[model samples]
Target: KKAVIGVVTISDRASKGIYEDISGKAIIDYLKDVIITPFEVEYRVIPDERDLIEKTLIELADEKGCSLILTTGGTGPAPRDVTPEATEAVCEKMLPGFGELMRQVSLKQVPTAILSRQTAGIRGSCLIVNLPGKPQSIKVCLDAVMPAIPYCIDLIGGAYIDTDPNKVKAFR
Candidate 1:
């Protein structure tokens, strides 16, 4: 089966072209290296607007039929960082463990990690995860939660997802 994954970068500057979308690129790069399963990316770059973020997520999950949707940026405690709230608004069930694990792992590297509000949840059959905007922190969060993604998709009856064992092994 062909798997479709959504990569969304939620940033005002990046969406406006004031700055390049490195966060989205970083997510795609990580997926490219770790996922051996052939899949297509439905990528988007949008402003840090709650309504737009929720709209894009629904479009990707319900309309685009993406099995997994990973969003970068807008997950901090700052005023404009509304990615976590948007994610919670659209999801059926919140997976707080993903957020906890990511923050726990990230705190080892930087104290400011606690300010991140990263989160994950289920929207229809798709899994939507809010990730940090920083490129390096993006990798740290992905590494901490990615191992269970394939199995989580399996449980949700989404598309089959596999990983390159050399990089990160699927839990089941």
Candidate 2:
């Protein structure tokens, strides 16, 4: 079977139905353009709760059999922003470079970008990446680090992924 990818949108307002979930859709749209492989998506929207996020991540990776999980929101410095902490709790190996590159790319846009705590890591056979909440920021961060995700997934023994060169040119 082909590998599946999961997109989790963590936000208090979105989960409460107070606002539309543009972040999750942005992720799906971005993947649609970048990923050339035939894969499925396990998409979800939840509140900014660490335990829930952690549990969902485990379920997506272990039970749902997803190889890559991308989460947007709950990555700011605010008190409720705990995506990074939850990701670290469930992940087996931390990938600091992902966060560094995300911050670097975001910094080019805003001076407060340093306050963002986006991150990524490995859990079982899956890679979980924490992305920004805004649709524009999500695109920026994903574009900045997507070139490395396929190679990283390859090293971790996950399914091979090919990006559409017309949308995203992979480095290797």
Candidate 3:
């Protein structure tokens, strides 16, 4: 069966149509460039409210059955940057490695990267990962940890995801 991935963008201003959501679009564009597997994307754009974030995550994992959920924005240290808190609320397991690796990679670009609260976790058979807000930062973090996402989903009984090493390699 094909895989199902979720892309959620959490930004108060963007949700209200204040600015274009280029960050979320970057994720889709990069995935199209990296993943060759036949998959469907379940995407959403919402404000940076913890409750709404939690609700959307649960809906994606429980109802939509998304194997992997990628969220962009609201991962900063600001008062409204609560994506990680929301993700923590709905996830059954927290995977620190993703955040660590993403931070390590992000540090190479901007020193303030340490302020990002991006994280990853699991709920049932689905994996929910929070990402940085900037479009370029999303690619940097995703490239750092995405290689292991498919294998992680496998451990949780999700559908298989195949990637070409030339594009993005998955560790066995």
Candidate 4:
């Protein structure tokens, strides 16, 4: 079956046209490069609001039937940053290892990576992962975690996510 993936960009400034949303596009590009299986994206650019984040996630997971959701931005400790909180609110289980591995990999590049509160969780059949706002960091984090995404989705009863072996050797 084809995959339905959600790419969400949570940024007050980007949502208001202060700047273009490169983070969400970064996720889409990475998936395109790595995933060999057919897939469609449910992309959204929204402000850093917890309620809306929760609502968006629910609608994508429950209504849109997305099997996996990759979210960027708003993972910092700033007052406006609340993606993790909203993710936690809508999720039934938290997968801390995604955040831990992402931070571990990111710290090798920049010290500020520790400031990110990125996380992953399951909501019904969808697996939602929170990533950093930076495009470069998004690639790095996805590279570190993509290997496990397909199998995780399978365990959670989601669509199979197959990756290109030349780009990433997705584990079963």
Candidate 5:
């Protein structure tokens, strides 16, 4: 069975079409490049509203069975950055190590990485991970956490997520 994944762009500007959502597209591109297992995306663009973000996440996990949901934007320290709070509210279990490793990897590239408070959590069978809005930072954060994502899904009783060892190296 193909893996169903969700990609969300949590930005008022992007949602309002002030700018294109390249950040959301970046996650799709990254998945296409690295996922050896067949998967399809359920993409979304929403304003940085906590209730809306939380609702969209629940829909993806509960309705779509999106075993892995990746969200970009609204993850910084700004007032509009409420993705983490929404994620925490919907998740039954919070996985702090995902964000910790992402920040650790990101710190190697930029010192201000500490200010970005993106996080990950488990919503039923779905694993939701918040990535920084910047494209390069998205790459940096995903690279560090992608390795452990598949195994996390396995533990949570989601779909099997195979990966290209040469690209993602999803460790079992």
Candidate 6:
């Protein structure tokens, strides 16, 4: 099978069907516009459970062979926000710069950005990125660091991905 990208929406309300998950849909739409390469997405929505998150990440990276897994939500300072911890548990290496850049970009909009714990990590050939819950923040964070994502995936031995220069630029 060809390589695939995993988009996971981590939210209690969304998982419980209390609210619609526009964040995950935003990610899919943004990727569809930016990524020029032919790829498929394995989309999922789950509650904020650390074990479930870790297991789902492993399933995507190892079993499903996803090249990239981007997760939205469960990255705040709240008690149930455990995406970062779950990512760290399943990853072989952690990329601190992603969280730093996300916060740096988010700080421009909200002072509470400091409370965000968004992060990224490496699991086998997959690069997992943790994003905030808000749909707007997802765009901001993705735009801020997407330039280096393709290169990072290359360095980690993931599939090649091309981007539309008019919409987004991927750094070599």
Candidate 4, residue 161: lDDT: 79
lDDT by residue (tens digit), candidate 2, 62-161: 8998889999988887899999999999988999999898999999999999998888999977999998888899898888889888888888888778
Model 4 regions more than 4 Å off: none
Name the lDDT of candidate 5: 0.91
How many steric overlaps does candidate 2 have?
Answer: 0
lDDT of 4 by residue, 1-172 (tens): 5689999998889999999998888999999899988999999999888899999999999999999999998888887889999999999999999989998998999898789899999999999999887889889888889999999999989998799988988998
With a 3 Å backbone cut-off (N, CA, C), the pairs that clash in candidate 2 are none
Worst 10 residues of 6 by lDDT: 131-140
Candidate 6 wrong stretches, greater than 4 Å: none
Q: Return the TM-score for candidate 1, rounded to 2 decimals.
A: 0.97
Question: Across residues 69-89, which tens digit of lDDT does each residue of candidate 5 receive?
Answer: 999988888887899999999
Question: How many pairs of residues in model 4 come into backbone collision?
Answer: 0
The estimated TM-scores of all candidates read 0.97, 0.96, 0.97, 0.97, 0.97, 0.97
**Total backbone clashes of candidate 5, pairs 3 or more residues apart or in separate chains:** 0
Q: Which ten-residue region of model 1 has the weakest summed lDDT?
A: 72-81
Q: Model 2 — which ten-residue stretch has the worst lDDT? A: 163-172
Q: What local lDDT does model 1 show for residue 112?
A: 92
- The residue-by-residue lDDT of candidate 1 on 38-149, one tens digit each, is 8999999999899999999999999999999999988877888899999999999999899889989999998998888889999889999988878898898888799999
lDDT of 6 by residue, 1-172 (tens): 3659999999888999998999999999989989998999999999998899999999999988999999998888889989999999999999999889989999999999999988999998899999877778888888988999999989989998979888879988
Candidate 1: lDDT of 77?
73
Candidate 3, residue 36: how far the Cα is off, in Å: 1.4
